[PDB]
Amino acid sequence: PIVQNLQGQMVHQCISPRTLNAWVKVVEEKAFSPEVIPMFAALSCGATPQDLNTMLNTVGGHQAAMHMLKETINEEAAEWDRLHPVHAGPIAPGQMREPRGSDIAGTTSTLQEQIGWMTHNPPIPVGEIYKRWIILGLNKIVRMYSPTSILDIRQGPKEPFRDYIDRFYKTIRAEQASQEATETLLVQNANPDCKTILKALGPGATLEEMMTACQ
Amino acid sequence: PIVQNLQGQMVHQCISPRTLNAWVKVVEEKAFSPEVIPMFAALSCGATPQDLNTMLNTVGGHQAAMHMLKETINEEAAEWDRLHPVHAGPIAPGQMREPRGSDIAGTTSTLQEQIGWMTHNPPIPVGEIYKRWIILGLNKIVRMYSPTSILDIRQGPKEPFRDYIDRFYKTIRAEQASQEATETLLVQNANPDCKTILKALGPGATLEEMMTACQ
Amino acid sequence: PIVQNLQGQMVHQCISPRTLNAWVKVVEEKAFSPEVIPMFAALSCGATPQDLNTMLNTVGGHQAAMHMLKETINEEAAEWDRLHPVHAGPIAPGQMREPRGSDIAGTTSTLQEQIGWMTHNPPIPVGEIYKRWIILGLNKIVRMYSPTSILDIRQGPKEPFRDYIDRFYKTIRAEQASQEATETLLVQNANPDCKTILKALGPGATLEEMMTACQ
Amino acid sequence: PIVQNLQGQMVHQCISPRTLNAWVKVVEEKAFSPEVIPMFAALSCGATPQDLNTMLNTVGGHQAAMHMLKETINEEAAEWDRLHPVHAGPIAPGQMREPRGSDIAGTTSTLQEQIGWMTHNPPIPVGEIYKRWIILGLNKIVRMYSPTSILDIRQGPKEPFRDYIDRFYKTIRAEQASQEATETLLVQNANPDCKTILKALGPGATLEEMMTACQ
Amino acid sequence: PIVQNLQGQMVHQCISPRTLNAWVKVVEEKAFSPEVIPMFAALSCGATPQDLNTMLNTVGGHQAAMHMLKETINEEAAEWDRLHPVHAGPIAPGQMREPRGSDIAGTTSTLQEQIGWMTHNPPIPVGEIYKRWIILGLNKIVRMYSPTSILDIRQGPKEPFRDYIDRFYKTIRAEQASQEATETLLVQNANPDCKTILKALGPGATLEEMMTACQ
Amino acid sequence: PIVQNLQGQMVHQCISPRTLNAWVKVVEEKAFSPEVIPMFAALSCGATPQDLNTMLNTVGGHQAAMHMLKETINEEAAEWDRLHPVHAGPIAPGQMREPRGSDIAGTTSTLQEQIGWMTHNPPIPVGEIYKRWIILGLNKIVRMYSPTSILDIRQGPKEPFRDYIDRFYKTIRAEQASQEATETLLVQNANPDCKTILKALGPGATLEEMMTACQ
């Protein structure tokens, strides 16, 4: 990544063994549960495009997902080039060239070039731009791997209301990849006894009040 | 987070893998036992609003609780805006804008803006303000998930007094989310034999003296 | 905590995840065995009162003990105020106020105020003063939870002398919370065969010589 | 490795116990699954040739693979010498000598010499050149150890499409050591029921659309 | 401990959680096997007397050993005072006082005083002096807890020579607490068949040659 | 060890708990498998002779090996003294004395003296010289503990060629302690069916080609 040192200058640092292991382990343990995305975002803080590829490449399983991600990345890179045409020809000696999509994704740019862009004034934040494309792709994967429609999250006869709502909002998060009348659906999908109580509370009731009421 | 370096300047640092993992693990192991809150507060030392959202977002379970927390945050943000109206219109070029509720909660502000506020002189401590809203919400969740009324904590016939008092004060802490005649209730809820001894001690007895007496 | 940086200035640093976890784990594994106290003292090196409360608050069990500790802290704070009366009224603008007991215990003081006192010249060491009150309270808890009188530590007929003395001095440590004719009691509580040998050695024998003799 | 310090100078640092252990453990757990290569590349960030040999030498198993790697390294070193002949004879006193293949591979060069080349202006990046030779060799090993032809990855009658595609693209990655009408082969190797659905989608369908269709 | 910072000045640093845990764990796992002593010496690198007491105090078991250690420390402290009499009376204002035995052992000196001595020019190395007394005491404990005389280490009829010599030199190390015609005793204690071979080798044979011969 | 700080000066640093534990654990898990030596070399990067003795002394088992190592060290030290006679008599006040063998091995030199030599200009690299003697001794131990002659590594009738070659080159490494017509022996020791195939390939075949051929 690129970070500021003790002196107060933006410099390249090697990706740490702890960061590398943390990412590999969260994917192994959580697959593409929605909470994997903010972990990725946090673990890749200050990442160069090279670092982002490193993280994605260290993942051993889920190769269908990784292929889908590559497709998303390629789509975002093509769109970048459409919006930002770079002039062809030889580079001005010793000067910074303009990044293409494939340079942002780290396929055609060097670490040195990436550092050059990210530490320029003003910065051309290729790490952040690429991370946005990656997260866009990861959100599609999260939605793909969400196993259940919210329509099928219904409270069991003996299921505690707390456990039901945990399943309900877990499912909403996966189905929408953490992107924000669900309270109405929550009541509709509740079991008969809790549903009666929730109807009596009326509209405008908070989740807190509903939980208290069916507790 | 924002910390002071070796040179003595307040700078942004990436949230560490160790911090991220620690928070995820304490929630996995302790759910919303009262001691989770001071751990959150300590692990989020110097946190930007972005960091606070990262920590909350890395939590995979407990989505009913997280939805309740969002409601609390939205309430505190609306109240902030009522007390602190920001003037609409274009920003003075190159100048710091005033934070709205949604900027404090990190939904409408950038990391750069957050850094700007928190390192300004004087600091506009958006990380600390948001953390206060979050802890307020977490305390409600702790009280919600407290499984037992203090009225139902009673010493068993063969239960050691020490074990009884551990249950008693554990329950008080959960019921009040660690926010401070309970000594009287403690005696009332004691078993017959210990209760007789505690009555003989009289009023003004310390917990230490009571424990000695029923030991 | 407050520490000196590379440059050589006393600055605030966030309490580390490793420190937080270490304290929580030693309490989980050792409860209030005497060796927990020096671990607490070492892990809270340079701690502000806020840090000390953080450490105590992260403990989930042992709430009877924690309530006893609060009583000790309140007693020491009242005594502080009796010995050190602070003048009431408005503070001199921009000047350091005098700490009351509740400020030392971190209930009525801010982190900024705590930093101000601890880094003043000369320092008003509120972290160290509070830690002393806490350790005083923890020592009472260690003595409370010591399960056995030294009178009941007696060598078994087939018990190796080494194992007996380990139990003996372990018990002395707990009963006195590591605060320093026990050699005589050690002999009295020894089994018949070892006792005869130890009597023959006579007075002035070291523990080393006694162990050799009954080995 | 060679890294830049807080002051902003390129200096040698000892390889860390965490780096050493991470590499040894990933080889123990993953052997030569394709994802081992980008982990190697990341863990050897800034590595001197000495560091690269250290990492390779700490591996206890897989000695057939390590012998193959040595052969690749020797081939790349011979080619280097063919392209870059070094003038024989005594060195100019106190001056930098030109690296031969065996100097790049760290068999005939000292750490001091390696540091000299890598921190020269311009740098003669012997660590990076050697790492390229090593990765070239590791890719051959990955392809050697790939256990299955893509021709034999076929969807089972009851196998979920997601699981089939995971096997498919895992195999492509191994067979090509992560070096980029497979969508056509993917359809051909699908089971009858999914194959019919995929034919109806027609050409130009994304993996995402195919997965949706056979989900 | 006292260490030199990045700037190059000798300053106090808090003992680390990793150091504290390492010492506690090595004692738990190895008791007073001889190799515990050099681990103690290494983990207490740069330790103040306060740090040394912290390490010793964090040990929960082995209280007979710890009492023996205290006796050794008290003996060494009395001898220090005999050799180095300190002048009684009031201290020169703002000046360094001379350390007594109890000051070196950290019972009557403050951390500040300890820092003062250890960073003075020339340094009065109270940490190193105390560590010497402690190691002297630990060596006595190692010898006390050595379970077997070298006279009873004899090669079994079917015991491999390598395993026999491991037991032999392990025992010598414990019996002498790692303080350096044992080759003759090694032969005498060997089994008949190996003994015959070793006699044929004659005198002046190395351990290496003996091992080869009975292999 | 001796390392360069942030400022760029060579200073002593305490050996880390992580380094100490890593070495102890690799010996516990791997004994004297050949890969232990490069781990030792890497973990002792920048080590003083004191540090090297610390590492060797923290090893609890394998005392026969450690005694053999001491013999090798004593041999190398005697040879050093033969080649480098030091003038006897009093030292020039405040000046650096010349290291003898026993000073290089850290038996008769202080840490201060060791630091003096290693940071002198030019450096007298006593840490590196001693490490060379130690590795020479460790290589002898690796060869001693190598359990099998390469003559007895033969491919089983049903043993996969890959597994056979792993055993073959593992054995060569141990027998030669990683110090570099074995391809011919590899073929001779192959099973009948693979041997026939390998003969047909002819001379000059790479290991890669042989593996392919018998795969």
Ligand SMILES: Cc1[nH]c2ccccc2c1CC(=O)N[C@@H](Cc1ccccc1)C(=O)N(C)c1ccccc1
């Ligand atoms: C955790 C979660 N569950 C969801 C369900 C549907 C849609 C989105 C989500 C999210 C992500 C989610 O909304 N996370 C929150 C942070 C958060 C997490 C957990 C509790 C409270 C606040 C967030 O990122 N932002 C910007 C936010 C902050 C305050 C209010 C609203 C949004």
Ligand SMILES: Cc1[nH]c2ccccc2c1CC(=O)N[C@@H](Cc1ccccc1)C(=O)N(C)c1ccccc1
């Ligand atoms: C741990 C605990 N149990 C409770 C029961 C009811 C209400 C609150 C609580 C708390 C939190 C609790 O009160 N924690 C204490 C710190 C503490 C923790 C444990 C032992 C001693 C001191 C705290 O945060 N503060 C500010 C405090 C400090 C001194 C006296 C009184 C309060």
Ligand SMILES: Cc1[nH]c2ccccc2c1CC(=O)N[C@@H](Cc1ccccc1)C(=O)N(C)c1ccccc1
């Ligand atoms: C460990 C222990 N057991 C005890 C039994 C009764 C009373 C107190 C204790 C203690 C604490 C205990 O006395 N710890 C010792 C340090 C120590 C620990 C272990 C072995 C040697 C030295 C200590 O803190 N100090 C100041 C000390 C130092 C030297 C001599 C006497 C006291």
Ligand SMILES: Cc1[nH]c2ccccc2c1CC(=O)N[C@@H](Cc1ccccc1)C(=O)N(C)c1ccccc1
């Ligand atoms: C992970 C993987 N599977 C493959 C199958 C066949 C050939 C190569 C591969 C690779 C390596 C692979 O291609 N990894 C990607 C990074 C990556 C990994 C995972 C998901 C998305 C992006 C990479 O290194 N680069 C340079 C890249 C970046 C964007 C688009 C295309 C390539």
Ligand SMILES: Cc1[nH]c2ccccc2c1CC(=O)N[C@@H](Cc1ccccc1)C(=O)N(C)c1ccccc1
């Ligand atoms: C490890 C060990 N076994 C012993 C048996 C009897 C007496 C002492 C011991 C020791 C401690 C022991 O002697 N350790 C060695 C270091 C060492 C450890 C292991 C192998 C090689 C060198 C040591 O500390 N020093 C100063 C030393 C160095 C070179 C030669 C002789 C002594």
Ligand SMILES: Cc1[nH]c2ccccc2c1CC(=O)N[C@@H](Cc1ccccc1)C(=O)N(C)c1ccccc1
């Ligand atoms: C790992 C190994 N197996 C052996 C068998 C017989 C003799 C020696 C060995 C070694 C040590 C071994 O040779 N290790 C290699 C590094 C290495 C390790 C593994 C794969 C590729 C390169 C090494 O240290 N050097 C200097 C080296 C580098 C390039 C070519 C030749 C030698």
